Amino acid sequence: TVPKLYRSVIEDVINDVRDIFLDDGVDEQVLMELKTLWENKLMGQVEEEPLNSEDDVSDEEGQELFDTENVVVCQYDKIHRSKNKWKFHLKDGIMNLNGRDYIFSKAIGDAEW
Amino acid sequence: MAYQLYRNTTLGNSLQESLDELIQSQQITPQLALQVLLQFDKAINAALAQRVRNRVNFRGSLNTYRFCDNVWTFVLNDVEFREVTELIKVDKVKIVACD
Amino acid sequence: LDLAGPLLAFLFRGMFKNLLKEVRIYAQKFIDRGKDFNLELAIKTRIISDGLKYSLATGNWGDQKKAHQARAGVSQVLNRLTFASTLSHLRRLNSPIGRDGKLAKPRQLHNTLWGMVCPAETPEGHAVGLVKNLALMAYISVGSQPS
Amino acid sequence: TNYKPVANHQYNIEYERKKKEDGKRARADKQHVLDMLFSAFEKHQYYNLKDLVDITKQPVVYLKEILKEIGVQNVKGIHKNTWELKPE
Amino acid sequence: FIQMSVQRIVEDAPPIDLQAPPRYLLKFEQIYLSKPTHWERDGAPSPMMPNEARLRNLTYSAPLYVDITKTVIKEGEEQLQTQHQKTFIGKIPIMLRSTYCLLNGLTDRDLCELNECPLDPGGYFIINGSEKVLIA
Amino acid sequence: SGIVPQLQNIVSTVNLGCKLDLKTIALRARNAEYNPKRFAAVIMRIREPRTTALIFSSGKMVCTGAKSEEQSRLAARKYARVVQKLGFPAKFLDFKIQNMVGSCDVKFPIRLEGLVLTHQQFSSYEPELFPGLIYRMIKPRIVLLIFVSGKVVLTGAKVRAEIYEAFENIYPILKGFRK
Amino acid sequence: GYKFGVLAKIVNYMKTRHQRGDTHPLTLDEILDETQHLDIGLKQKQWLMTEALVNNPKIEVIDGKYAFKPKYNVR
Amino acid sequence: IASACLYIACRQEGVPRTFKEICAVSRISKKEIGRCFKLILKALETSVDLITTGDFMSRFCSNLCLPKQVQMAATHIARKAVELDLVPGRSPISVAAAAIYMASQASAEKRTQKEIGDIAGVADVTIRQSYRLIYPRAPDLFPTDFKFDTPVDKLPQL
């Protein structure tokens, strides 16, 4: 199922860029080579000024530096939180779980912070 | 000059890598690669909003969240994805949202 | 002869036009603001209630601000001195002078009043011949469509 | 059944909801605001302050300060004194 | 006037057209009259007898209602048509012993029960307790 | 009386003495959320003290959610240090508690109708707008929400002593209106 | 847009550069790179060189290059 | 300010109108009327006697076309329920609507929950909650000299 969507995306992509390739004056043969390579790659403190009285008041700061874990890209229609829990109302989006690609239209999520 | 969401993905990475390979061969100017990426982003955005009609659910624990430029960066831990047909378990996930 | 109905219908259209004008003004403010308007709040009910009441209360016809050209004396306190005076007052006819009355004198008893207006009943003084009374079997048509 | 008790009129809550969803206009950086103003200047010689606000979508006070820094207002005898996007 | 002229006046009034671009229309179709009513301090409606109007210096008036149909177009190929049935628009003073008076069709004995003279011909209005006659 | 109000919320304001770039803080801060269209400040939250702090570009910050004065200052210092770690010269100047909120139960129902009649000059009881009774204490500038269930909420106090003093004043009054 | 939305950023960017204290002049091409106007029209380059960068009272032509005019301004 | 003043004037005259009733005649929302209502009292240093359930029985019952006996029973039920403290903390309007519903259901003229809510301005859910609290003591609340078209034991349960 997922591969069929990818092929349809390719068909839309090539059609969408046909006018651009004609406009910029580049030969259409470039597009044919582009798809070939594209397919191959995929498959008492009185003085308070100093703040040093407290140390190690933060966790690891490299969580966003790596980004090697699964990443979810989506669009949000409403996100509200009531004193304990974050409720996610996210519409159509894509996900990359353990390499596998997942696509959803409507999703609902509840989380605790 | 667009939303530019799916660029940092396996699909986006492969397209960027392919464009770089052509550039190294002097087959495409850098401007053409940018135009292709912009067209690709428009095509995928329209495709997802149209050809995706499946509903899913998930639960988990939130560890970190951010919001800047109307972009959420939720970081969830121990997330269980529940679907009518399948269930998935993931230790950590980063959610990037826009609107 | 303009009886109560046609006289009242004259007031209602002026007062109804103000009502429709008022809702137009009220709605225009909200529409321009970008928000829909509430119909119940747009209607000013005092326009018809006080307009009809004011004219009957005072006898002036037209809006209160337009009293300069407002006809006076159409509405009078019913005479309850005797039953005859009550009956006569309810059958009283007025002949306004205005510009038209100047051209021809209406005080004189015209031939055509026979059977329609009493030839004897008319106030003495400045109002001789101008205030009239229906004859007993006199009838004033209420009107109907010529379709 | 007229003027029935109601906590809030339907037209009022719908308008309130729309304003909340749209939200207040934010203060964009001067460079971006300046670029938009100059780009729109080509379309027409002169702009009204109210109309210019919609195009730029910036706070009136903030927009006026930016416009004052470069733009000026010329007195026109046909309608009224209006802002001119040309600094000179 | 009550049965025909008032309805004709409302019907003959042009529809109210308003443009923002959402477009709004108001059309008034049907006119209703209730019996002469008086509202107490607490707001409780009650039929108003002509003698009570005379005694308490009230106006013998009947509530007037009009059916209003509102149609709104927002250039989105959708039309919403909402009708407000019996929209209060004012009160018409009522001529006594007329078809819309409470003393309509009442027998002479019934009139005496209401402290009304059967020989009273009607044909006038009670405006702030004063019996007002409209001179032709 | 035997009942001591429990501080439910502490609001304190501090000045970092340095203009801040809200956009930069949101992009770098772990838990900060910024939305200039919605609000002009930056909302950041922390778990261990369980407090929320609003950071303004002018350098002033407001911390809320702390259940004690010590927690509020510690939470405020944590927020100030976090901003400092982001490259700003944040300080801890003129830290002040702006409002204190306390809640307690009298362990008996209260007749609000009688209370307002006897204390009309201080009590505004409007069930349509709010079921609870709003009592505005004078000698302490404290506003108290008295409920038929017996729960009493004190707010507007600047120091803990004000909360305890206000409840002490109101308790005998409430006792007289026991249901 | 065209012929108007590009020249302004050159003036605006140049004003900010002086506030850093860099009195050194700058070339037409050099300023274009930092202003993200490398794709400016060909006839705009000559128009700016011939008219905009000389007629303006805040542009100083030095050794063929252009520098801000703090001398005219009171500092 | 005018809408809040109108509300106060009604209270000061002994014929209160609920905030929703005043809002229905004004473009100002009920929230804003309440905000100006409290400010006006502070500015004028005045006060308004607390509303009761019987302050709305005449208007509500009359607007519902209910007989006088139903109104009398409805007034008695609401006052007795408050006296017995069967509805502690409930808004007087909610109690009045529920009391009207109980009396209405016990007479020939029966009014649905929706009907009473529209005139009373109280959601049928709110009427349901208050009615459930007073339903158990129905025989005690009803006036002694009351004729039941529907016996009290057979009143609606919900």
From TrEMBL, chain C:
Localization annotation: Nucleus
Domain RNA polymerase Rpb2: 76-140
Similarity comment: Belongs to the RNA polymerase beta chain family.
Function: RNA-dependent RNA polymerase that catalyzes the extension of a non-coding RNA (ncRNA) at the 3'-end using the four ribonucleoside triphosphates as substrates. An internal ncRNA sequence near the 3'-end serves as a template in a single-round Pol II-mediated RNA polymerization reaction. May decrease the stability of ncRNAs that repress Pol II-mediated gene transcription. DNA-dependent RNA polymerase catalyzes the transcription of DNA into RNA using the four ribonucleoside triphosphates as substrates.
Protein known as: DNA-directed RNA polymerase subunit beta
Organism: Sus scrofa
Lineage: Eukaryota, Metazoa, Chordata, Craniata, Vertebrata
